[PDB]
Short mmCIF file of all heavy atoms in Angstrom, two decimals:
data_model
loop_
_atom_site.label_atom_id
_atom_site.label_comp_id
_atom_site.label_asym_id
_atom_site.label_seq_id
_atom_site.Cartn_x
_atom_site.Cartn_y
_atom_site.Cartn_z
N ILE P 1 -189.50 51.07 -55.62
CA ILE P 1 -189.44 49.64 -56.31
C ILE P 1 -188.85 48.61 -55.32
O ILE P 1 -189.54 47.55 -55.18
CB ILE P 1 -188.51 49.68 -57.65
CG1 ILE P 1 -188.83 50.78 -58.54
CG2 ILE P 1 -188.54 48.31 -58.29
CD1 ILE P 1 -187.82 51.91 -58.59
N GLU P 2 -187.66 48.84 -54.77
CA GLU P 2 -187.15 47.92 -53.83
C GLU P 2 -187.99 47.62 -52.79
O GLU P 2 -187.93 46.63 -52.03
CB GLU P 2 -185.74 48.40 -53.31
CG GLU P 2 -184.61 47.41 -53.42
CD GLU P 2 -184.11 47.02 -52.02
OE1 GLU P 2 -184.35 47.75 -51.15
OE2 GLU P 2 -183.65 45.89 -51.79
N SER P 3 -188.82 48.54 -52.34
CA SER P 3 -189.87 48.33 -51.37
C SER P 3 -190.83 47.25 -51.55
O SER P 3 -190.98 46.40 -50.70
CB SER P 3 -190.58 49.76 -51.10
OG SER P 3 -190.64 49.99 -49.69
N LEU P 4 -191.53 47.19 -52.65
CA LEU P 4 -192.58 46.13 -52.88
C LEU P 4 -191.95 44.83 -53.29
O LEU P 4 -192.47 43.79 -53.11
CB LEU P 4 -193.41 46.74 -53.97
CG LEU P 4 -194.75 47.37 -53.48
CD1 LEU P 4 -195.63 46.47 -52.75
CD2 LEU P 4 -194.37 48.54 -52.49
N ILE P 5 -190.79 44.92 -53.94
CA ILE P 5 -190.04 43.58 -54.39
C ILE P 5 -189.64 42.83 -53.16
O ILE P 5 -189.70 41.54 -53.23
CB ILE P 5 -188.92 43.96 -55.14
CG1 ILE P 5 -189.00 45.05 -56.13
CG2 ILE P 5 -188.30 42.74 -55.75
CD1 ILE P 5 -187.74 45.75 -56.39
N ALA P 6 -189.30 43.47 -52.07
CA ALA P 6 -188.82 42.74 -50.93
C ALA P 6 -189.83 42.27 -50.02
O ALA P 6 -189.79 41.26 -49.42
CB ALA P 6 -187.83 43.72 -50.24
N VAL P 7 -191.02 43.02 -49.93
CA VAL P 7 -192.12 42.62 -49.23
C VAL P 7 -192.37 41.06 -49.64
O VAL P 7 -192.70 40.18 -48.83
CB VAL P 7 -193.32 43.42 -49.49
CG1 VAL P 7 -193.09 44.84 -49.17
CG2 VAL P 7 -193.83 43.15 -50.88
N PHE P 8 -192.29 40.84 -50.96
CA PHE P 8 -192.45 39.56 -51.49
C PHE P 8 -191.17 38.65 -51.19
O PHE P 8 -191.27 37.60 -50.55
CB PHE P 8 -192.60 39.60 -53.00
CG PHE P 8 -192.08 38.37 -53.85
CD1 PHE P 8 -192.85 37.19 -53.62
CD2 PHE P 8 -191.15 38.47 -54.66
CE1 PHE P 8 -192.43 36.15 -54.45
CE2 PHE P 8 -190.64 37.35 -55.44
CZ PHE P 8 -191.36 36.24 -55.21
N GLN P 9 -190.00 39.08 -51.69
CA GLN P 9 -188.76 38.35 -51.33
C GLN P 9 -188.54 37.88 -49.86
O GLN P 9 -188.22 36.70 -49.76
CB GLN P 9 -187.60 39.17 -51.71
CG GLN P 9 -187.62 39.82 -53.20
CD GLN P 9 -187.18 39.02 -54.19
OE1 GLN P 9 -186.21 39.20 -54.89
NE2 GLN P 9 -187.93 37.95 -54.54
N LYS P 10 -188.89 38.83 -49.04
CA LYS P 10 -188.68 38.56 -47.62
C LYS P 10 -189.45 37.34 -47.25
O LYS P 10 -188.75 36.25 -46.58
CB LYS P 10 -189.23 39.67 -46.72
CG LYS P 10 -188.94 39.50 -45.31
CD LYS P 10 -187.62 39.99 -45.00
CE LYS P 10 -187.29 41.45 -45.34
NZ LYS P 10 -188.28 42.39 -44.56
N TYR P 11 -190.67 37.03 -47.58
CA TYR P 11 -191.48 35.92 -47.31
C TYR P 11 -191.01 34.79 -48.38
O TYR P 11 -191.22 33.56 -48.07
CB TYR P 11 -192.96 36.06 -47.22
CG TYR P 11 -193.41 36.21 -45.91
CD1 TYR P 11 -193.34 37.33 -45.06
CD2 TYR P 11 -194.01 35.04 -45.34
CE1 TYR P 11 -193.94 37.38 -43.77
CE2 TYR P 11 -194.43 35.11 -44.05
CZ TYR P 11 -194.49 36.22 -43.25
OH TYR P 11 -195.02 36.38 -41.97
N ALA P 12 -190.72 35.36 -49.50
CA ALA P 12 -190.43 34.36 -50.77
C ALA P 12 -188.95 33.85 -50.68
O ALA P 12 -188.54 33.38 -51.61
CB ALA P 12 -190.73 35.09 -51.98
N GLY P 13 -188.24 34.12 -49.51
CA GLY P 13 -186.96 33.63 -49.47
C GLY P 13 -186.07 34.83 -48.72
O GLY P 13 -186.00 35.88 -49.19
N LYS P 14 -185.47 34.34 -47.64
CA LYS P 14 -184.54 35.12 -46.79
C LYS P 14 -183.11 35.01 -47.26
O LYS P 14 -182.21 35.97 -47.20
CB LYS P 14 -184.69 34.93 -45.39
CG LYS P 14 -186.08 35.42 -44.75
CD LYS P 14 -186.78 34.17 -44.00
CE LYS P 14 -188.18 34.29 -44.13
NZ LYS P 14 -188.87 33.02 -43.95
N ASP P 15 -182.76 33.83 -47.79
CA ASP P 15 -181.41 33.57 -48.22
C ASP P 15 -181.41 33.08 -49.65
O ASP P 15 -180.45 32.23 -50.03
CB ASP P 15 -180.72 32.38 -47.25
CG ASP P 15 -180.76 32.76 -45.87
OD1 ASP P 15 -181.61 33.53 -45.46
OD2 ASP P 15 -179.83 32.43 -45.11
N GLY P 16 -182.39 33.48 -50.42
CA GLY P 16 -182.44 33.03 -51.84
C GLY P 16 -182.84 31.58 -51.98
O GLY P 16 -181.93 30.82 -51.82
N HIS P 17 -184.05 31.45 -52.38
CA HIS P 17 -184.56 30.00 -52.62
C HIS P 17 -185.11 29.79 -53.99
O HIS P 17 -184.65 28.92 -54.77
CB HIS P 17 -185.42 29.74 -51.56
CG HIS P 17 -185.65 28.08 -51.34
ND1 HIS P 17 -184.97 27.29 -52.06
CD2 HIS P 17 -186.36 27.34 -50.56
CE1 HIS P 17 -185.25 25.94 -51.74
NE2 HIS P 17 -186.04 26.10 -50.75
N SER P 18 -186.11 30.61 -54.26
CA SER P 18 -186.81 30.66 -55.56
C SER P 18 -187.38 32.01 -55.85
O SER P 18 -187.22 32.99 -55.07
CB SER P 18 -187.92 29.48 -55.50
OG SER P 18 -187.39 28.32 -55.13
N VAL P 19 -188.19 32.05 -57.00
CA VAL P 19 -188.80 33.22 -57.47
C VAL P 19 -190.26 33.35 -57.09
O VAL P 19 -191.07 34.09 -57.81
CB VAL P 19 -188.58 33.53 -59.01
CG1 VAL P 19 -187.14 33.91 -59.33
CG2 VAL P 19 -188.95 32.26 -59.76
N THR P 20 -190.54 32.45 -56.11
CA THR P 20 -191.99 32.40 -55.70
C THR P 20 -192.23 32.55 -54.18
O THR P 20 -191.11 32.90 -53.59
CB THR P 20 -192.55 31.12 -56.20
OG1 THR P 20 -191.67 30.09 -56.18
CG2 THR P 20 -193.14 31.17 -57.56
N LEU P 21 -193.43 32.44 -53.73
CA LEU P 21 -193.74 32.45 -52.30
C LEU P 21 -194.56 31.46 -51.83
O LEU P 21 -194.42 30.26 -52.02
CB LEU P 21 -194.15 33.93 -51.94
CG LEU P 21 -193.94 34.55 -50.51
CD1 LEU P 21 -194.72 35.67 -50.29
CD2 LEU P 21 -194.09 33.38 -49.57
N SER P 22 -195.79 31.87 -51.29
CA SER P 22 -196.74 30.96 -50.73
C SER P 22 -197.96 31.70 -50.25
O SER P 22 -197.96 32.69 -49.55
CB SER P 22 -196.22 30.10 -49.60
OG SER P 22 -197.25 29.90 -48.59
N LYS P 23 -199.20 31.31 -50.76
CA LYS P 23 -200.39 31.91 -50.47
C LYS P 23 -200.52 32.09 -49.00
O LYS P 23 -201.09 33.19 -48.56
CB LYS P 23 -201.62 30.98 -50.99
CG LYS P 23 -201.64 30.75 -52.51
CD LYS P 23 -202.84 30.03 -52.93
CE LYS P 23 -202.79 28.69 -52.27
NZ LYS P 23 -203.30 27.54 -53.18
N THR P 24 -200.19 31.14 -48.28
CA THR P 24 -200.27 31.25 -46.83
C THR P 24 -199.15 32.07 -46.18
O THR P 24 -199.47 32.88 -45.26
CB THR P 24 -200.11 29.77 -46.22
OG1 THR P 24 -201.50 29.21 -45.98
CG2 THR P 24 -199.41 29.66 -44.81
N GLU P 25 -198.06 32.00 -46.66
CA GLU P 25 -196.89 32.91 -46.26
C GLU P 25 -197.32 34.33 -46.39
O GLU P 25 -196.80 35.12 -45.49
CB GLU P 25 -195.61 32.61 -47.02
CG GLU P 25 -194.52 31.86 -46.34
CD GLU P 25 -194.40 30.46 -46.87
OE1 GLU P 25 -193.61 30.26 -47.72
OE2 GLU P 25 -194.94 29.38 -46.29
N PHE P 26 -198.07 34.65 -47.28
CA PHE P 26 -198.68 35.95 -47.44
C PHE P 26 -199.43 36.39 -46.31
O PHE P 26 -199.55 37.51 -45.96
CB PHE P 26 -199.46 36.07 -48.79
CG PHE P 26 -199.20 37.36 -49.54
CD1 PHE P 26 -199.15 37.24 -50.92
CD2 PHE P 26 -199.04 38.55 -48.90
CE1 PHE P 26 -199.00 38.44 -51.68
CE2 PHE P 26 -199.01 39.74 -49.50
CZ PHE P 26 -198.96 39.79 -50.88
N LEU P 27 -200.21 35.44 -45.82
CA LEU P 27 -201.14 35.55 -44.70
C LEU P 27 -200.46 36.39 -43.55
O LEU P 27 -200.94 37.41 -43.09
CB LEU P 27 -201.60 34.29 -44.21
CG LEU P 27 -203.02 33.83 -44.62
CD1 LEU P 27 -204.06 34.84 -44.26
CD2 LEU P 27 -202.87 33.80 -46.26
N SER P 28 -199.38 35.66 -42.98
CA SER P 28 -198.67 36.25 -41.92
C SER P 28 -198.11 37.59 -42.27
O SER P 28 -198.14 38.50 -41.31
CB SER P 28 -197.53 35.23 -41.47
OG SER P 28 -196.94 34.69 -42.57
N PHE P 29 -197.57 37.84 -43.36
CA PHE P 29 -197.02 38.99 -43.82
C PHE P 29 -198.00 40.22 -43.68
O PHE P 29 -197.65 41.24 -43.07
CB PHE P 29 -196.44 39.02 -45.16
CG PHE P 29 -195.62 40.28 -45.63
CD1 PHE P 29 -194.40 40.43 -45.31
CD2 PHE P 29 -196.40 41.18 -46.36
CE1 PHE P 29 -193.81 41.61 -45.64
CE2 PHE P 29 -195.67 42.32 -46.77
CZ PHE P 29 -194.33 42.54 -46.50
N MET P 30 -199.22 39.97 -44.26
CA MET P 30 -200.25 40.90 -44.20
C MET P 30 -200.60 41.34 -42.84
O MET P 30 -200.62 42.56 -42.51
CB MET P 30 -201.44 40.49 -44.90
CG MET P 30 -202.50 41.50 -44.96
SD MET P 30 -203.02 42.06 -46.58
CE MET P 30 -201.45 42.86 -47.08
N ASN P 31 -200.82 40.40 -41.90
CA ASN P 31 -201.11 40.62 -40.59
C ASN P 31 -200.01 41.08 -39.63
O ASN P 31 -200.22 41.68 -38.58
CB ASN P 31 -201.73 39.31 -39.96
CG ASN P 31 -203.00 38.91 -40.58
OD1 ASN P 31 -204.02 39.58 -40.56
ND2 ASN P 31 -202.93 37.67 -41.29
N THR P 32 -198.79 40.85 -40.13
CA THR P 32 -197.58 41.11 -39.43
C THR P 32 -197.05 42.52 -39.80
O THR P 32 -196.37 43.25 -39.12
CB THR P 32 -196.52 40.04 -39.46
OG1 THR P 32 -195.49 40.27 -38.44
CG2 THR P 32 -195.78 39.95 -40.90
N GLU P 33 -197.16 42.81 -41.10
CA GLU P 33 -196.54 44.01 -41.70
C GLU P 33 -197.43 44.79 -42.56
O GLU P 33 -197.07 45.64 -43.52
CB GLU P 33 -195.32 43.71 -42.55
CG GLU P 33 -194.60 42.31 -42.15
CD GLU P 33 -193.16 42.38 -42.17
OE1 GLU P 33 -192.50 42.79 -43.34
OE2 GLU P 33 -192.39 42.15 -41.25
N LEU P 34 -198.69 44.62 -42.36
CA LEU P 34 -199.81 45.38 -43.09
C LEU P 34 -201.07 45.21 -42.38
O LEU P 34 -202.15 44.81 -42.99
CB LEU P 34 -199.89 44.80 -44.60
CG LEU P 34 -198.95 45.36 -45.50
CD1 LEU P 34 -199.37 44.88 -47.01
CD2 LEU P 34 -198.92 46.74 -45.55
#
């Protein structure tokens, strides 16, 4: 569980900002960690 939640949180906030992310922020994550 903690694994998939964080993949999101990481891009969706490193120091706690909101409960969302960004379509583009996902781009880099995929190419950088997937």
